[PDB]
Amino acid sequence: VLVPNLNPTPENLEVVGDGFKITSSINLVGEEEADENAVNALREFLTANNIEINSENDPNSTTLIIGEVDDDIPELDEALNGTTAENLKEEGYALVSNDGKIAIEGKDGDGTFYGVQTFKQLVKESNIPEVNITDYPTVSARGIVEGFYGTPWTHQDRLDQIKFYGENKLNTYIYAPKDDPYHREKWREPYPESEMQRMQELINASAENKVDFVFGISPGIDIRFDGDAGEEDFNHLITKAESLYDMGVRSFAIYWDDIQDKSAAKHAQVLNRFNEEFVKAKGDVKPLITVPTEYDTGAMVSNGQPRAYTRIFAETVDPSIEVMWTGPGVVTNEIPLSDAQLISGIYNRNMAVWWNYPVTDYFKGKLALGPMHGLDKGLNQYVDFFTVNPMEHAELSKISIHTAADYSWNMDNYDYDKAWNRAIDMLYGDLAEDMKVFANHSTRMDNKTWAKSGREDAPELRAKMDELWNKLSSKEDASALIEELYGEFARMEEACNNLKANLPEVALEECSRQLDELITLAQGDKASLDMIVAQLNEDTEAYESAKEIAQNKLNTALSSFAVISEKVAQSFIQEALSFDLTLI
Amino acid sequence: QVLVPNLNPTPENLEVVGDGFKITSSINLVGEEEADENAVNALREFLTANNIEINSENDPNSTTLIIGEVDDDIPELDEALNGTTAENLKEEGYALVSNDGKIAIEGKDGDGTFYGVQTFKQLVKESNIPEVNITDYPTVSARGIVEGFYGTPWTHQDRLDQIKFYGENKLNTYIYAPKDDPYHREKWREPYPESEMQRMQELINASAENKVDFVFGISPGIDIRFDGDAGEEDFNHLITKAESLYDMGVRSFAIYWDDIQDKSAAKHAQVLNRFNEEFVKAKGDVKPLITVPTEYDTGAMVSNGQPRAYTRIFAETVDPSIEVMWTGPGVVTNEIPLSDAQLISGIYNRNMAVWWNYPVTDYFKGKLALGPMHGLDKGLNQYVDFFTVNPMEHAELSKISIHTAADYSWNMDNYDYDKAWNRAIDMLYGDLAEDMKVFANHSTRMDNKTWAKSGREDAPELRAKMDELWNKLSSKEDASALIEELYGEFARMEEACNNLKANLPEVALEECSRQLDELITLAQGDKASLDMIVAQLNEDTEAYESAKEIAQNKLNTALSSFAVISEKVAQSFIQEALSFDLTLI
Ligand SMILES: Cn1c(=O)c2c(ncn2C[C@H](O)CO)n(C)c1=O
Ligand SMILES: Cn1c(=O)c2c(ncn2C[C@H](O)CO)n(C)c1=O
């Protein structure tokens, strides 16, 4: 009857009935014409939900019909009842569930696979609402770049991530882990046979999930440009790219982010020649991706104009090349429309975004657990390619990555708070509410210098703390608010204890120190209220006791590796410690 | 060529007219018999201290000093002034001309004469005086200090010393309301017993001798009754308390409502009105009554552009002659912009009195407030004619900020807070001034993280250089030169503080010893932070871990100590460095 949480939000969805229960066995129509990856995804779903396939038809049992628009299948047409994927953009699809029948029509193969993923999300306990849906992405390339420093994702993390992207309609995965010598330290060298199977597994998994596996080369460590050596090194770049092509790689990136020979003309020459001699020569390779040595607005621009390097790079690099930038800074609050317009103007095309959130390599004590935040909802005007750099913490990165999927697939309707709530609801099931209490305190990233991004920590509790100080300093009665805040702090502690006892090991292993840290702070916040109450009661012994406890809790948090809620739970203790009620 | 020395306050009008001259070891004194008595005593005190004798009979070889008031008939004074005059200046005004062996001081009144002397005292260095024409007068009529801080009281000797300091800097108001004198609050009805008489007399006499109005602060809010027979008894107690003070020589009074448990605006106002009528008006020689209403900062007084009930009623009831104090937009606040003064003064339909809560540190005692008057609108005088600051329990170090309040209130229009700050330290600390500046520069900003904050930011130039260090490092720009420069600043900080520890007089050192040790610790931690950065640039892991451990111990020592200084600068720098991972830029 009711529509389950969906992610991404589909473009068009209307409830057209009251839904029905899918029978224990079903009629499968189109299984041989439809996209193989979509059909394999469907079969895996039905198999896991104990829904058998009928070898012969039966008007009683539910009928599921699947295929592309370019297929002449009139059963699909009949089931679709007008609505079609014919005029939708790439990766788009139509889905109709109406009395005992579900029709999935992709605009293409990719689109068909996405139709299935939505279907999977619509079904609960063999029940499905009945709706009419047409859907397609706001932006063409949506995904993740594995560009963080620190402990690398394991082979199993990547495989799991790859499936998670497919399931959320993310179509891009840029493979450039700092731990793989063949992306950088041995960039010339083709993969040895002893590495071939691992790579093949990533390449295959990506393909079966409609994910573009982008191989990222950073030749900057030692590439040469001039004379015979430059020629040799260029040929090695070709050599390497085709050994990868022979494994099935069809997307490439070349990074100039870390080179010291800051020569714009030479960087772009290598890109242009690679583009001619490889990308275009092959015909089925996707547009070349690049990161220029200047890759954030502050490094790219002075006074509304490009700097020397960026001016030359933008003038030299072929228009068919995806150029990545990070926004106004490497790690920064926002990408407002005006920033995208500026950089897009300079490069005379739609840009690619490398968004350093929720990555935490620069401030590892803190987990980044908030939604996409600060990215203008009109960005698609100037951006055709959107990626996020995640944490070394693969599992917990799913919260933020989940909201990125929504932002990039349905940008105009993206609401960061509802997206954030939905991500945790869909990922954490019965522990969703407790996870929210904890994660609410861990959204803001800030290394106290050059790197800051994210939604503020626990903003509503922050507003309440502010009101307590106003009331106390204005001689107004705060007894009801003090009471409310004790409730807030007890609830922080309780939720974190719950998460400790009940979280899956795969999540708990990423966040146990931060859980303890939040508990410590909740206990200090409580002791801080005790100080205020002692001063209102003029009780010197109760004050001194609360004060030593509050101070100890704060000292524990400060010296601990884990970091959380700095401006809210932690700062509150310092505010209370410096507050002297006797002065008014 | 004798240059003009530092002067405080900055005189309204000063023109250098000659190259200056030497004041003989013996001088001719002309007018000392008709001129203001306190002014003359201040002059003799100065002459004596600088081994300058007074000629018994005229001697045409000697420097001639002529002193008097405008309405005094002295032909030598008129001749020496050569057209310059104090005749059309406001009260406390005076003229001073030093020209060719003659120094003429003409006050518009007795107070102005005294202040002419104070300027003369500042003009003379080693018997040399510049040749200048001066006409001078204050922007604001009442300038001074309220002893209104919580904490350890000023001693009797601190107060006597403060009063003399006010006289030298032309501050004419001292509001005596120490929390720890019972007769001010806990025993407000009771007149001073015989045991306390000498002590009170000394303060009153020292104030008068220094042209300082000694305001007695009464806080009856503790237990004053308003209705019926008890209300009548308490009002008569107020009257008999005030006349016992009057008999001791007190001519200024403040009555406070800041701490009363009710908000009975009409009753507060009627007590003042009646006191005004039966005492202030009746005596004829009592200055305007001073009050602090129960709501005394804009936040407590105003809601949506309009007075709150208490304020509206108090404003409606209180007599127009009464001085009403407010502290600005908050009790302890960054600024009083012109608009705030305009709003409150409009509500009260009168020129307001300011109770400015800086350099008071009672709400964050680990930090010394060593900055200038900061955030006060330079056109505030349009709406304000009474300016006081609430200082620290630390009487000696309060002089830096008070010195700047003297200059802001006497010469408001030309007040430059950086220059006033520098001049305050130069004039107070002599040979240790440059070192004192290094230290005090890290201790101007007050912030308890909640309701209270005010003052110039700590060490802003250094803060801008630290910012630029992180900009360079995160932009992969070479930072060697800046790093070297910062090593120099941190070494300077430590060396200034060590010299201060060794050479500060005990009266100053006593108040700042812990803060000195704290700045040294922070400086050492700052140096260690640089060593961390350098070790990361050199890819030296062992050098990194060793610098880091020092940085963290220095920071930890700073955080756990009572003393607080340079929170956003020297202290924050270490935390910034500890959170920065250079290995990934
Ligand atoms: C634009 N860009 C990055 O921002 C980046 C990177 N490797 C790491 N980062 C950013 C880092 O994760 C933020 O601390 N690479 C290889 C990159 O090209
Ligand atoms: C306007 N006002 C004050 O601001 C004040 C005060 N006693 C203390 N203060 C302020 C305090 O020193 C700052 O914490 N009194 C008695 C007062 O009238």
Could you explain how this protein is built, in words?
Chain A has 584 residues and is an alpha/beta fold. Chain A contains 18 helices and 21 strands. The first copy, chain A, has helices at 36-48, 74-80, 109-122, 155-168, 193-208, 227-245, 264-282, 297-300, 308-316, 337-347, 394-409, 416-428, 432-439, 459-473, 479-502, 505-536, 540-559, 566-578; strands at residues 12-15, 20-21, 25-29, 52-53, 63-68, 93-98, 101-106, 127-128, 131-135, 141-145, 172-175, 212-217, 251-255, 289-291, 301-302, 305-306, 322-325, 351-355, 383-388, 445-446, 452-453. In chain A, the strands form five sheets. An eight-stranded parallel barrel of chain A has the order 10-11-12-13-14-17-18-19. A seven-stranded mixed β-sheet of chain A has the order 1-9-6-7-5-3-4, sandwiched between helices. Chain A is globular, with a radius of gyration of 27 Å. One ligand X0T binds next to loops of chain A. Chain B: GO terms for molecular function: [protein]-3-O-(N-acetyl-D-glucosaminyl)-L-serine/L-threonine O-N-acetyl-alpha-D-glucosaminase activity; beta-N-acetylglucosaminidase activity; carbohydrate binding. Chain B: Residues 140-430 are annotated as: Catalytic domain.
